[PDB]
Design a protein around this ligand. Sequence first.
Ligand code: ATP
Ligand code: ATP
Ligand code: MG
Ligand code: MG
Lengths: 600, 600
Amino acid sequence: SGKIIGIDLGTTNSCVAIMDGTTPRVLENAEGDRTTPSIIAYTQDGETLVGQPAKRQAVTNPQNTLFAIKRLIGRRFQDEEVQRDVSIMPFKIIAADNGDAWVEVKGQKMAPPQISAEVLKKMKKTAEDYLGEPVTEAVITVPAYFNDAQRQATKDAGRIAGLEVKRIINEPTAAALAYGLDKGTGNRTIAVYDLGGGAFDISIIEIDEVDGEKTFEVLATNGDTHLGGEDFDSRLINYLVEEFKKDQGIDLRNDPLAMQRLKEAAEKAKIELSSAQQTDVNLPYITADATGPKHMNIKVTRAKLESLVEDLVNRSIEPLKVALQDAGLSVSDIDDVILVGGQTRMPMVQKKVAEFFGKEPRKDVNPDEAVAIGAAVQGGVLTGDVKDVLLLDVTPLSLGIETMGGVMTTLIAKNTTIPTKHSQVFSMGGAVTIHVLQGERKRAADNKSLGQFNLDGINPAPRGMPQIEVTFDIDADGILHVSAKDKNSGKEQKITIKASSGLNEDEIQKMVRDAEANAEADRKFEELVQTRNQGDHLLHSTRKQVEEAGDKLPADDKTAIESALTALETALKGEDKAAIEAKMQELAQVSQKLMEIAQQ
Amino acid sequence: SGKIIGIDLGTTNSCVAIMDGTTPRVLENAEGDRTTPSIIAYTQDGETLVGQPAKRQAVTNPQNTLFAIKRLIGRRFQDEEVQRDVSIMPFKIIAADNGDAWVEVKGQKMAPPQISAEVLKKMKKTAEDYLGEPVTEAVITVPAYFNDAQRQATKDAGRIAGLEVKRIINEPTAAALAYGLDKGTGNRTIAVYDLGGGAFDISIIEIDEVDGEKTFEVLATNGDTHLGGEDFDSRLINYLVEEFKKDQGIDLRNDPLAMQRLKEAAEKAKIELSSAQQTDVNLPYITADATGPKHMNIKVTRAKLESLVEDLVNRSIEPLKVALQDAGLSVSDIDDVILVGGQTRMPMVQKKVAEFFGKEPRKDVNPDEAVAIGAAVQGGVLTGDVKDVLLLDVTPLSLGIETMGGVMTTLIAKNTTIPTKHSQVFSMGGAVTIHVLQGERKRAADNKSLGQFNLDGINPAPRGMPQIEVTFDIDADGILHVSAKDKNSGKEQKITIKASSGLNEDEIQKMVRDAEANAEADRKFEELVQTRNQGDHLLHSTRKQVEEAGDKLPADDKTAIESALTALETALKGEDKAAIEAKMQELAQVSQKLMEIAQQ
Ligand SMILES: Nc1ncnc2c1ncn2[C@@H]1O[C@H](COP(=O)(O)OP(=O)(O)OP(=O)(O)O)[C@@H](O)[C@H]1O
Ligand SMILES: Nc1ncnc2c1ncn2[C@@H]1O[C@H](COP(=O)(O)OP(=O)(O)OP(=O)(O)O)[C@@H](O)[C@H]1O
Ligand SMILES: [Mg+2]
Ligand SMILES: [Mg+2]
């Protein structure tokens, strides 16, 4: 029911679009911006900020501002990437009871999907404000290289936000839909290079004209879900931290508040160096010492920045080589190179990509909105409003199991088109345990574990010939479903999953309720502010009343009203809602009493 | 030759678009932004900054940062509107020799068109970078209510930027083109309400279908060229100044740095109050008393803000009434209300407009880019690329002359469609002086003077029957051209214009050369930056050369090379190009030498 909205849920920024009749349209949020910082904050006084308002106060609220949660979602606390972030992120990152990576604010433990849900709720509200009706369904994007846990956790975030997730769409695929919508873009093969704030994808995609309809087929995909702008900032921040040690004899890394100003300054500097060739990091009173206040002043050149991050850029080139090999194509087979994501605005990135492909990337693709637009198009395909568009995506990782000798044994090869299914008999009746993993490495230890899937035996029976067949389905969302039956009886077998990541149904249901309670509490937090407005309106009117009365007003009456006004003004400066309300009531009674005496 | 680019030259922000084949496209500037702040700055070391870099340093350089120049362009120094601004603007506004309003920076007097040209040059360069080739032609926008002087001055700015201005297009007309391009927006009548940073326009526009082609006809236009966001900010700034005065007993108005910080904070507060119901203005260390530093902290509710500016909003409603009357329509006849301009994002503004028209404004119009898009479309109509699009605009002000009694006599009524022509015999041979004015007021003294147009007599001659006919042409740009001729002989009569506003050919030519000199100076300034980058590259490589040598390096050689490294690092900390280049040279020679010795 209603419109299926398209939400690009980004590490750094989020963006929502719809089908406006036959044309996709990106929607401005309440603040008037076409994108929304993927940031949530909890203030000391207990307010929940989302988006720009949360971004604005981040510098002074290190611990209770959550950002880049997309780098934690669907991960385990003991993951190398997470363990590194633990020491780096200013907010607190902890292990959930099941070992998943969670955060903690003011003593409260929260799962990443709960945090992303807040961002999704704002995007949902954005669409509803625009449309003038409720929105309950969405297509939500994920990086192409997201694994099973990361996909499912993103899907759970959508549910926690009150959205039925009709499709999880791979971000480069979404960008391709956006690009190929324009008639005259048929019968070509493109490379979509997407380098954002947190993730990197490369997809090779063919757009063809079959039976008078446009088909988008992903030939190969690769990337790195933990490579993006955040890592570029970090290289520059560490340089600035090391320089200030040498220069002013002080280590800033021990100090959260200084690091906030620096983080902010480094990102601005990085961004400036995409157009200028020099930038100044000026942080007066960055810190202090025995000798007094300290100030940071350091010029950074483009050349300096480049030497700091070139290996990150090279890291994005290697998956390109693998993607072309997997697709069986050379660079000359690629008709268009498409750059997506804010971090691709770096000249070095554009230059290295141009040089690899031996051609310049297109300039007519919006690096900030293409993904959301494609998510909207995908939604329109689902509702049937978008005709003559067919899409065939793949799974980015090999699905396998740990077999005898601790080896990784592949069941479904990477770049297999989805949905897809693989069935296999695992037992003639004895119990079965299956350790499922994703990845390309030879040893199970080197791949991403999805969990242990356990089946009980089937007891011996006259004329029974148990054949326990296990089926691995990958659906259109790129998500795995494992089921089993006895082929001999047709009876389904219960599978018990152990050591898997993710939320269970009970947690999800509780978190859905928590999000509704949060909404209520937010509506409850606003009362103080709403009462101030009313207070200001009242002040304005009763002042006019006093002016009108002029000298006709007796001193005792003039004094009583002027005291009531001042009292309300004072209360308004404060934070006590009850006091404001009482002073408003007293002022109203004096305004009414004056009125009544004037009529006499 | 080349593309005719469309440039929205705004009081606050500027935006450039082109026809990308058959589709209009807004172009990002070098900073990656789809719009550019109309801000020009001159730094202490003599650099000229435009756009975001100028905006960024305004807080510390308020005297030599020029902004809102569109509020001075085409105006006289003694104009009431300018005189008010003289006391408000942080930079120095002065009278030119002819009385026009100019600005002075560091002893240099400059004409508004020279300043705006710097913004147009950036927009021009933006298009050139995208297209990969030179751009010499443009369509440039002006408020529909701009008078003759304002139009010509804007056209002069285009020339000074090296642009042949093919069309001056009224901004609401541009927005209508953008809106009506969408097939299926035909046969309707729209009201375009445009409230920006400096100017207000209302235009009533009919979009029809004649002989297969779409025609856009402006039925009426009105507005106020000195009413916009800057005035909203100003109301809030004065409130904040007064509150701090009552609170801390300090008057900030004489503190340029404090006032610049306040200006910025005030606009941010105004903008938040478009989506939130309360905002906090915080300015630590805003001033210092003998008691110590003082900090500004005050909460502002939407209710407070609305009471500070409601009369500004109401001032925009009265021209709506006049426009409908001039169009001969009622609100009922309006099919679509279109809001353009950032200042229309204010809830009070939208509500007042919705209430006036009795319908909700459309939501599917881009308030920041519609005007640039329309300018690009107009450009494509000029090149013959855009087909079946005809536009018919009007002149917004009555054109008249001062007749006996000091009365205003109308020659061309407001809302007459342009281009248009009016011819009249003024003399049977005697010398003639014609005082030309624009406006609707009955007394000449109350209208805008365009100058005195003088004609010499024609001497008595046998068979001569001199009939001096003066022709008033208003061209497609909405600009006046007065010519005269003797109908009896056909000979053209020379007109001498006195007491008029604007730049003469000689000034324009000199200003064109000055701008080219500024570009050259800019390339010069870049030299230092380029040298710094090369320095960083050189440091990087030679450091690797030292490491690779390790212990093999003799103590005297290691000392020498490390001295040279340090000396370059030191020079790069300074601002002396010569020293940097010398230290680069010495480091290079030492590197080369050790290399040679290592080869031995
Ligand atoms: N001009 C610029 N030059 C370099 N980097 C930039 C520029 N502008 C933005 N960025 C960077 O781009 C990143 C954000 O890009 P984007 O909004 O596409 O990410 P995202 O979609 O939120 O992330 P992801 O897709 O990785 O989940 C940030 O790291 C930001 O610093
Ligand atoms: N959310 C908002 N609420 C209120 N005002 C806003 C908002 N966003 C921007 N503005 C204001 O809108 C103005 C800028 O709008 P815009 O960019 O349309 O003006 P412009 O085209 O440069 O000016 P003009 O058309 O008057 O020459 C500024 O005064 C700015 O403060
Ligand atoms: Mg992204
Ligand atoms: Mg404008």
